[PDB]
Design an enzyme around this catalytic site. Structure first.
Site, mmCIF file in Angstrom:
data_model
loop_
_atom_site.group_PDB
_atom_site.id
_atom_site.type_symbol
_atom_site.label_atom_id
_atom_site.label_comp_id
_atom_site.label_asym_id
_atom_site.label_seq_id
_atom_site.Cartn_x
_atom_site.Cartn_y
_atom_site.Cartn_z
ATOM 1 N N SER A 1 69.770 82.232 -42.255
ATOM 2 C CA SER A 1 70.780 83.263 -42.541
ATOM 3 C C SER A 1 71.617 83.041 -43.803
ATOM 4 O O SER A 1 72.413 83.913 -44.159
ATOM 5 C CB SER A 1 71.714 83.476 -41.348
ATOM 6 O OG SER A 1 71.005 84.011 -40.244
ATOM 7 N N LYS B 1 78.811 80.396 -45.324
ATOM 8 C CA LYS B 1 77.813 81.145 -44.566
ATOM 9 C C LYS B 1 76.820 80.173 -43.942
ATOM 10 O O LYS B 1 76.223 79.350 -44.634
ATOM 11 C CB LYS B 1 77.052 82.125 -45.466
ATOM 12 C CG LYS B 1 75.931 82.876 -44.744
ATOM 13 C CD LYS B 1 76.507 83.935 -43.817
ATOM 14 C CE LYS B 1 75.472 84.417 -42.792
ATOM 15 N NZ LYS B 1 75.416 83.490 -41.618
ATOM 16 N N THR B 2 76.631 80.279 -42.631
ATOM 17 C CA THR B 2 75.730 79.368 -41.932
ATOM 18 C C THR B 2 74.308 79.912 -41.859
ATOM 19 O O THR B 2 74.054 81.101 -42.114
ATOM 20 C CB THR B 2 76.206 79.135 -40.501
ATOM 21 O OG1 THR B 2 76.275 80.399 -39.827
ATOM 22 C CG2 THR B 2 77.578 78.477 -40.487
ATOM 23 N N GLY B 3 73.378 79.033 -41.499
ATOM 24 C CA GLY B 3 72.015 79.440 -41.222
ATOM 25 C C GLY B 3 71.473 78.540 -40.135
ATOM 26 O O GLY B 3 71.709 77.325 -40.171
#
Length: 259
Positions: free
Chosen positions: A49, A204-206
């Site tokens: 993501s 922003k994470t993934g």
């Protein structure tokens, strides 16, 4: 800070990687000096993501000289929903505005929101094209080292820096991207857990299978220049969980070296 403290930090990152069955990809950049702490910086990792930052920037670029785009509502139906859509699933029918979709995909990692924005731009290739336009020749939005949907920590660090701190976007658009990412709801256990509590973090994470655990963004200390943090991790076992603690620890190692 100093080169020797950075050398120490890079060995600490190597020792951190030894604690899991996978790869740690890391870049931290102190923008006061361009001092860089890196680990596997030029290797490709699945971005998961984290690409949603590049997405949202591309959307903001379309909105330059057309601020009303952000208030434009995009309808969609249940059949348009994909897995993990905690915000968009509540607004089937009339849909959500472009700004709402950006906020949903950045702050909650909403997948349908991302798909709708990708469509608005004209497809995944338009996101890759946007990346090229801001100097990123590495990012590609399209498993045993499949290069599809991957980037490198170095490439993403440069893009994050240019987008959130630098001049890739106009000033107003930079401000909006930061505002959205400062309000992220999914990263409390990652970069935010590893850097000092006094620092504001836009991230922003993934997360994905193969223990893929990522977090990218910028920390804003109160009386220093911003520090870019990019953390990618992925593992050999498909079943493995992402390790929030490793991501936090990596950020901590760099933060310690830069103070």
């Amino acid at each position: 800070g100093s080169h020797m403290r950075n050398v120490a930090a890079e060995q600490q990152l190597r020792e951190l990687e030894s604690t899991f069955d996978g790869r740690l990809g890391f870049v931290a950049l102190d923008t006061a000096t361009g001092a860089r702490i890196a680990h596997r910086a030029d290797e490709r990792f699945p971005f998961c993501s984290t690409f949603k930052t590049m997405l949202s920037a591309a959307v903001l670029a379309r909105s330059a000289g057309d601020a009303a785009l952000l208030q434009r509502r995009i309808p969609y139906a249940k059949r348009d929903l994909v897995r993990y859509s905690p915000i968009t699933e509540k607004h089937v029918g009339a849909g959500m505005t472009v700004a709402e979709l950006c906020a949903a995909t950045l702050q909650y990692s909403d997948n349908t929101a991302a798909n709708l924005l990708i469509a608005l731009l004209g497809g995944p290739q338009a996101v890759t094209a946007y990346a090229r336009s801001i100097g990123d020749a590495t990012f590609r939005l399209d498993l045993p080292g499949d290069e599809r949907d991957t980037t490198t920590p170095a490439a993403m660090a440069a893009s994050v820096r240019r987008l959130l701190v630098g001049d890739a976007l106009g000033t107003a658009q930079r401000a909006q991207l930061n505002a959205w990412m400062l309000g992220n709801k999914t990263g409390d256990a990652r970069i935010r857990a590893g850097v000092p509590a006094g620092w504001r973090v836009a991230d922003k994470t993934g997360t994905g299978d193969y223990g893929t655990g990522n977090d990218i963004g910028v920390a804003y200390p109160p009386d220093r220049a911003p520090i870019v943090f990019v953390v990618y991790t992925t593992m050999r076992s498909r079943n493995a969980q992402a390790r929030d603690d490793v991501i936090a620890s990596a950020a901590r190692i760099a933060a310690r070296a830069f103070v």
